[PDB]
Amino acid sequence: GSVQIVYKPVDLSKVTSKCGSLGNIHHKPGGGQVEVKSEKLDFKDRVQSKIGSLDNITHVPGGGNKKIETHKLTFR
Amino acid sequence: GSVQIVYKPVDLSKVTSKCGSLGNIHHKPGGGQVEVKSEKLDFKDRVQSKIGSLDNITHVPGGGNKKIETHKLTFR
Amino acid sequence: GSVQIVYKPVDLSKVTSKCGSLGNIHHKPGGGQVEVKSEKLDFKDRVQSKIGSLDNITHVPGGGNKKIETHKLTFR
Amino acid sequence: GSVQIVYKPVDLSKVTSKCGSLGNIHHKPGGGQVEVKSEKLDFKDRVQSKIGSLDNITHVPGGGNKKIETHKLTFR
Amino acid sequence: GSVQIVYKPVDLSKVTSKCGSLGNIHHKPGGGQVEVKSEKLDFKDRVQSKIGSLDNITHVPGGGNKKIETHKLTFR
Amino acid sequence: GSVQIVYKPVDLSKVTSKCGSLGNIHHKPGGGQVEVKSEKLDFKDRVQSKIGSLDNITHVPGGGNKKIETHKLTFR
């Protein structure tokens, strides 16, 4: 008794966009006033600390369209 | 007896957009006044701490259309 | 007994964009006022610390489209 | 017996004026039409006139900003 | 017996004026039509006039901002 | 017994004027049309006119910014 596996996915899909213009985009975050008082700061394992810091991303792609696809055949 | 597995997904999907413009986009977060008083800050494993900090994203894709598709086949 | 695995995915898929212009994009984050006081700062493993710092990304691709396509085939 | 004076006023304030025609969106506006018939014109003394205008005038004598700070410390 | 004075006022205030034609959306507005028949004009003395106008005037003499601060510490 | 004066006023404040026609979007606007018939013109004394205008005038006599600070530490 044979085993025959015919994995033939067919994809003709279109992922598209038409955009007339991307305009006046203004990312302007402002920090506050931040005061930390202690005798000790004591950070011991896998600690992430953000005191008064700003992390900023401005991502403006003319398309930014994504096709994400996965194929997985397992035989045992 | 023999085993025959036929895997023929057919895909003609359209994932589209038409846009006249992406406009006047303002992203202006403001911090406040933040005061922390202590004898000790003592962080001992896998601690995330954000004192008066700002994390900011401005994401303005002209399309931003996503097609996401997982195919999995298993035989044992 | 015989085994016959045929793996013939077919992709004709289109990922596209049309954009008329990417315009006046302003990324102007401002730091706050940040005051940290102690007798000791004591950081001991896998510590990330951000005091009053700014991390900025400006990313403006004319397309920025992605086609991600993992193929896997395991036989045992 | 001692004197300690700390003079640390912090200013993060904003003074802003926005005048006169900002941040508008016009999407596919039709073309305006103007017609005038006036064969014989006589303008004598101190005359100011417009005939058949289609003008998008913005006029801003205003919108000025004035910030004053005094910071006095007197010790005797 | 000792004196400690901390003079540490924090200002995060916003003063803002917004004038006169801001933040509108006009979507597919029709084209306006203006027609005038007036064959013979005589304007004699100190006349100010318009004929057949389709103007979108904005005029802002106002909208100014005045911020005054006095910070004053006297020790004797 | 001693005197310690710390004079550390901090300014991060902003003064901004925005005048007169900023950040507008015009997407696929139609062309405006102007017609005037006026064969015979006589303009004599101090006359000012426009005939058949289609003008995007922006006029800003205003929008000035004035900042004053006085800092004064007196010891006796």
Curated annotation (Swiss-Prot), chains A, B, C, D, E, F:
Transmembrane segments: none annotated. The record marks K8, K14, K18, K28, K37, K40, K67, K72 as: Not glycated. The modification Omega-N-methylarginine is found at R46. Phosphorylation at serine and threonine residues in S-P or T-P motifs by proline-directed protein kinases (PDPK1, CDK1, CDK5, GSK3, MAPK) (only 2-3 sites per protein in interphase, seven-fold increase in mitosis, and in the form associated with paired helical filaments (PHF-tau)), and at serine residues in K-X-G-S motifs by MAP/microtubule affinity-regulating kinase (MARK1, MARK2, MARK3 or MARK4), causing detachment from microtubules, and their disassembly. Phosphorylation decreases with age. Polyubiquitinated. Requires functional TRAF6 and may provoke SQSTM1-dependent degradation by the proteasome. PHF-tau can be modified by three different forms of polyubiquitination. 'Lys-48'-linked polyubiquitination is the major form, 'Lys-6'-linked and 'Lys-11'-linked polyubiquitination also occur. The modification N6,N6-dimethyllysine is found at K8. Changing K66I: In PIDB; 90% reduction in the rate of microtubule assembly. Glycans are attached at K44, K50, K66. Promotes microtubule assembly and stability, and might be involved in the establishment and maintenance of neuronal polarity. The C-terminus binds axonal microtubules while the N-terminus binds neural plasma membrane components, suggesting that tau functions as a linker protein between both. Axonal polarity is predetermined by TAU/MAPT localization (in the neuronal cell) in the domain of the cell body defined by the centrosome. The short isoforms allow plasticity of the cytoskeleton whereas the longer isoforms may preferentially play a role in its stabilization. It is linked to In Alzheimer disease, the neuronal cytoskeleton in the brain is progressively disrupted and replaced by tangles of paired helical filaments (PHF) and straight filaments, mainly composed of hyperphosphorylated forms of TAU (PHF-TAU or AD P-TAU). O-GlcNAcylation is greatly reduced in Alzheimer disease brain cerebral cortex leading to an increase in TAU/MAPT phosphorylations. This is Microtubule-associated protein tau.
